Amino acid sequence: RLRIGITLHPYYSYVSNIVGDKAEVVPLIPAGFNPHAYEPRAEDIKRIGTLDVVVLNGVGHDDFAERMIASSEKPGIPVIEANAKVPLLAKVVNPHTFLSISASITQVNTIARELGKLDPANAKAYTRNARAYAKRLRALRADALARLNKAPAADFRVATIHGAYDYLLREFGLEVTAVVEPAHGIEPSPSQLKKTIDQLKALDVKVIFSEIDFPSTYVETIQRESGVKLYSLSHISYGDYSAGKYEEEMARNLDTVVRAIQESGAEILYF
């Protein structure tokens, strides 16, 4: 029987939906911890010794896992690189591939394929379940985009605190004008925040996508100084691990974006 290690919350959703009850899904770090903050611990490193495989993002969102494997009782534990077939943006790679439907479909497939070689007695079911999960994801996207009447206007500029939504917004045909955090998971300095606030003003940035999971203080200040409309998105990293979390949280993100586009594209009449 298979014991599969996962690093982030969406990967628990991918692996749980591929295996069903044919394997155990084992989170590497505890639920409740912020994966950006998490500093490898003794008990967590010992757990790797109980695993057979570890499913990694490996593009910059689980470096802690690559480190905790090297100090484990299994330094040469079979590793699955979930983003092996995923086209990335932009040495500076955005690791938030999991906050995109098409990028998730490629990761689910890569995972089910590689798990199939490790457990050949269940490769049939893993392929079978990956097609089932993908269908639920394609429809999730389809329904969100079916609620969008008009495409955003030429002047529809968007900004985000965390550099996590470049992949999500790509599926709407949108680009992020500005990211408030200078580097991934790095809080800006007051000098940095003043320049960002100055750039959102110069470029007439319409909406700002803040964090639901681990919010920032400086958000009210950005909203105050620039008059930009605030909307919140989920990195899918807070609380409990579950099979449904990814598709649950993701559908909300897709409707927040649909809401943000429609709330700008508000049509009036007469006189």
Ligand SMILES: [Fe+2]
């Ligand atoms: Fe992140």
